[PDB]
From a paper:
Among human species B adenovirus, HAdV-11, has the particular feature of exploiting two primary receptors, desmoglein 2 (DSG2) and CD46, to mediate cell attachment. In this study, we elucidate the molecular basis for HAdV-11 recognition of DSG2 by resolving the structure of extracellular domains of DSG2 in complex with the HAdV-11 fiber knob protein. The structure shows that DSG2 and CD46 engage different HAdV-11 residues and interfaces without overlapping.
During the image analysis, two main populations of particles consisting of the HAd11K in complex with either one or two rDSG2 modules were identified and two 3D reconstructions were obtained at 3.5 and 3.2 Å resolution for HAd11K in complex with one or two rDSG2, respectively. Moreover, in the population with two rDSG2 attached to the HAd11K, each rDSG2 binds HAd11K in the same way with the same interfacing residues. rDSG2 consists of two modules, EC2 and EC3, and each one interacts with a different monomer of HAd11K. Regarding the interaction of the EC3 module of rDSG2 with HAd11K, the loop region centered around R316 of EC3 fits snugly in an apical region of HAd11K defined by two loops centered around D265 and D300, respectively. Several hydrogen bonds and salt bridges are also predicted in this area. The interacting regions of rDSG2 on HAd11K are strikingly similar to the one found for HAd7K and HAd3K, two other adenoviruses which are using DSG2 as their cellular receptor.
Residue numbers in the entry:
A (entry chain A), C (entry chain C), D (entry chain B): 129 to 325
B (entry chain E): 110 to 135, 147 to 194, 205 to 332
E (entry chain D): 108 to 136, 147 to 194, 205 to 331
The structure:
């Protein structure tokens, strides 16, 4: 009954993702949940800033940062390459179910729907949406999200790919120095066709 | 170091972790100093010496170039990074009172000038204005050229006119740069027509 | 298969919630459906105007209204404090499945993901979105929706909370006195991490 | 598990829908996936242009095109009236299952929630959204999406209707004649209350 | 094949959706074909070779780009000319041109023209989709001024009907909103933000 989720847990104790390649250690919490809904997978992603370099972004007008998830042939997470450094797992209450994942492949984007290195179908690999940032003054600041599915595989061990880029390009930064506390993106839910189990 | 002054470039609006350049020395690298030193738009990998971009996206319109003073440890060197321009600023028609006049029975005349402002790099295809006739010139009477020395729309008439006819020569035009708009502003471009009135001289 | 839904029922015959503080009795119908999708709950809400005062909001330019749902430790709707005055229940055809609910706690927002009275995690208690009002001339007016999850328990018996605020601020009223028929908002769907059963 | 989906498959070999009534034969691949989610149905729809006339649309500033899906009383696609000419079916890997379906009715729009020929409830039959078109220069042009559920049963055999209208109105044509490759709109996910099995 | 008429005339609304019946071409004695089209681009009309019903194509008609189409259609077993006018829908928000608006009132004068506001709308000239409808956004709670719409040039004639005493320096400055007489089309309603335009009144 719980094998239909594959997520990162709720509010991990420590950072589990390195989004900024400049940071020396994990600089944010990436909360990613994947749910099997028939032939589709519902993906529920957002980020909580932990490091100061990551939180200072709200003081700038043009910001962009990407989380890259690479999965091997069986759908396990490649922590040596991915932004997320903690392997995904099933739901055990409000935590990750410590145990072996045997049906990870079912949660991965379909290579049929989102092919690799196929220029003719390149446009099929893109998804778009908008999340929000709640300012210290209660205003909703929109953040564009671009998701790229299995379109490129740099490392030979990569069989599936998911890149989620949060970017905003406005005229006034959401925060000023003395007001910026943390960067929390409103949850983004996107659907993608899933690979056969 | 292999060169007292290195020189590289990186495109405006480039994504995170775009390899701006690589600092070579004959080793631990480090940015001794920056100029203007704000925002923090570049990152220097101390192990390999490669300067990449960061999450704080660049804007040529805010800073045209950056100077970095770097060091190698086991001397100081200069690194000049030029920000290449992209067409991410839509033209704005400065003047609103655009009322030209045509002399009766004249051809090859300069009806008026349309002032245009573009924040992009001066002298580039990202800054020259390209004019097209949204309406009012279906009969092929007026001609608009782009004066690149000032980025102005020279509006000239080539066809005759009879004052007694009082033909409605007013027309509405739209403005875009010579080069195609950058991907960040396309789908936001909205070419609102700018009217110009053509008065017929008595 | 029907124990995975808690909803208000499709088109209740009589009004089931009180959406305006100025209303003396029930003044609209709040269609609210919650579906368990793995570790998430998919919420699906909209309001159908019934009272004349509520239906007359279509003739204004700056409107907002909030529905507040409060749930006890067992997830039952606190009809005395909440706007919706009819308890939620499982699916039985297109009607509420009259009977006792025991798994209600599973549908409520998680207190680990969405905490009470925590100033360090206030931002992660907001969901945002847009629905639409279809006018008489078929023009679609957007309505901003702010959903606040468990962030404040005014009453002692409140253990979970959902506040759905609709608001529009337009330059031309969607309707005039002679054309307004009813304020029906197009369905709005959001997601939230669900508390353990 | 496979009986919870009803879809057109992933990347059909040949065009299976005729969006443009002018086109002689099938002119687009319409990917559509309906998944049961408790009391709701998750619809996942997009189009892939095939014919030259269809792909020309990327070179024009103002366009709109509609896809109609008419279903009988049992939930079987009326291929001779609808745009899609290939019946929907259950999941078999990435392809449509071969066999009869007895529970297609469950996937249809609720005639209670979304009535036929009732003006007083007309506003309830609309759903709105936005998808995107990724152009050759990596720019996402928005596309307005208007989904009308059961509103009008033109023919005596039509018991359910789904009308999905894509449209865009821009100031710069997304493509030029020399760069247009294929009109592919990004996936659109919407939800509607489903009819009792 | 014999055409029933040498010239057919029809009409189709602007922004009409795809597969909207523009008209029908009758012929008696048949396969119909669009020989030619002026201005020949974009392909906004489709002729049913079986029935002769001209429909609109997915390419939405824009009247502000082309106000009339001329189709030459040949019937086969001679060509007929069909003139399809495009009817205006209010898809243009009027815009006030003069960004520097300053009024002047003579002391103790009534029934005088105070100012003229120049406005531009791109829809059909002479129609309710083009004439400006002015409303007082603010400042005229005292009931001093009145705005009329000069339809000859679509201008806002602002007149005053009350006397003023210079020694007062009463603040008569106000702010108006400009909109067309006919209601905005469903495509541009909900995209209309009536940013009030200001006008300062200086008493001589």
């Amino acid at each position: 009954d719980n094998i239909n989720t594959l997520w990162t847990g709720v509010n991990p104790t420590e950072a589990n993702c390195q989004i900024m390649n400049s940071s020396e250690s994990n600089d944010c919490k990436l909360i990613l949940t994947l749910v099997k809904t028939g032939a589709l997978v519902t993906a529920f992603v957002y980020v909580i800033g932990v490091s100061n370099n990551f939180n200072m972004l709200t003081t700038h007008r043009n910001i962009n940062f990407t989380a890259e998830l690479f999965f091997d042939s069986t759908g396990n997470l490649l922590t040596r390459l991915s932004s997320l450094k903690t392997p995904l797992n099933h739901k055990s209450g409000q935590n990750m179910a410590t145990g072996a994942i045997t049906n990870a492949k079912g949660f991965m984007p379909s290579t049929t729907a989102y092919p690799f290195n196929d220029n003719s179908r390149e446009k099929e690999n893109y998804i778009y949406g908008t999340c929000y940032y709640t300012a210290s003054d209660r205003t909703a600041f929109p953040i564009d999200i671009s998701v790229m599915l299995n379109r490129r595989a740099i490392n030979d061990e990569t069989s599936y790919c998911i890149r989620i880029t949060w970017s905003w390009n406005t005229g006034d930064a959401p925060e000023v120095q003395t007001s910026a506390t943390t960067l929390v993106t409103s949850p983004f839910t996107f659907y993608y066709i899933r690979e056969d189990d | 170091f292999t060169q007292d002054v290195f020189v590289g470039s990186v495109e405006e609006l480039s994504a995170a972790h775009t390899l701006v350049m690589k600092i070579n020395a004959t080793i631990s690298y480090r940015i001794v100093s920056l100029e203007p030193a704000y925002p923090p738009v570049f990152y220097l990998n101390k192990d390999t010496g490669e300067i990449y971009t960061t999450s704080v996206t660049l804007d040529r319109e805010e800073h045209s170039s950056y100077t970095l003073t770097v060091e190698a440890r086991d001397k100081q060197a200069q690194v000049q990074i030029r920000i290449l321009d992209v067409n991410d600023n839509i033209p704005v028609v400065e003047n609103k009172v655009l009322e030209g006049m045509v002399e009766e029975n004249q051809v090859n005349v300069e009806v008026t000038r349309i002032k245009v402002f573009d924040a992009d790099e001066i002298g580039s295809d990202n800054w020259l204005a390209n004019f097209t006739f949204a309406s009012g010139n279906e009969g092929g009477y007026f001609h608009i050229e782009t004066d690149a020395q000032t980025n102005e729309g020279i509006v000239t008439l080539i066809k005759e006119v009879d004052y007694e006819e009082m033909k409605n020569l007013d027309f509405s035009v739209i403005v875009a740069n010579k080069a195609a708009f950058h991907k960040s502003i396309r789908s936001k471009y909205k070419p609102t027509p700018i009217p110009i009135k053509v008065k017929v001289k008595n």
